[PDB]
Every structure is written in structure tokens, then in C-alpha cells.
Amino acid sequence: TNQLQYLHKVVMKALWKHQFAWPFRQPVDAVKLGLPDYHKIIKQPMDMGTIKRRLENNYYWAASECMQDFNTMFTNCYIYNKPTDDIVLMAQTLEKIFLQKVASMPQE
């Protein structure tokens, strides 16, 4: 759709290149990061790499569905991490940009 094209080419491209985006471009690697409780707490892992691949494989049926995945990614970060962790501030910044760009999305 026009909306999914906007989410891919306008919203995602703007988040992806951001200086705080690198932790969110691929799944959380709990082994590498040494977080053995990560998958016990976060039951629906999500990241922008997964979202981008879904957008490109025509996985989504509606823009809302893609937006839900972005939300899961941010929510997972807030739920798992300590409120004072830098990663929370990084998610908040990206999330604010996501909403700004979503506000200008085409209507269909």
C-alpha cells in the first residue's frame, strides 16, 4: 500500500540511520549481551531489521500492523531495562521520531 511504502521509505529510513538506532537494527542477542533472563521476560522480540524484512517481503496487510511491530519493539525495551539505562533514552528518542513521521502518513 501507499502507507506501507511511506513506513518503509520515509519512517523506517529516518529511524534506521539515526545515531541511537544501532541497538535496534537487529534482534537483541541475549547470549552476546549476557542476558539469560531476556527471553523469559520478553516473549515477543521485535526489531527494525525484522520489520524492514517484513515490509520488503510484503508480509503486512495494513499500515497499522507494521506500526504495532514498532510499538512492540519500543515497549519491550521499556519493560525489560532499568528506567535509568541509556537504552531507554535511545528508544524514547527514536519513538518520538516515529510518531512525528507517522503523523504525516498518507491516508488510505
- Interface with ligand A9P includes 11 (CB under 6 A)? no
- Interface with a second copy includes 99 (CB under 8 A)? yes
Helix 48-56 and helix 63-80: axis angle, to 10°? Answer: 170
Q: CA dist 50 to 1, 66, 67, 107, Å?
A: 19, 11, 13, 25
- Interface with a second copy includes 75 (CB under 8 A)? yes
Site for ligand A9P in 59-88 (CB under 6 A): 77, 80-81, 87
Give the Cα separation of 108 and 98 in Å (integer).
19
Both ends of the chain: CA-CA distance in Å?
8
Cα dihedral 63, 66, 70, 75 in deg (nearest 10): 100
- Interface with ligand A9P includes 33 (CB under 6 A)? yes
Site for a second copy in 8-67 (CB under 8 A): 41, 62-64, 67
Minimum CB separation from a second copy for residue 29, in Å? 20
Binding site for a second copy (CB under 8 A): 3, 41, 62-64, 67-68, 71, 74-75, 78-80, 83, 88, 92, 95-96, 99-100, 102-107
Binding site residue list for a protein: 37, 80-82, 85-86
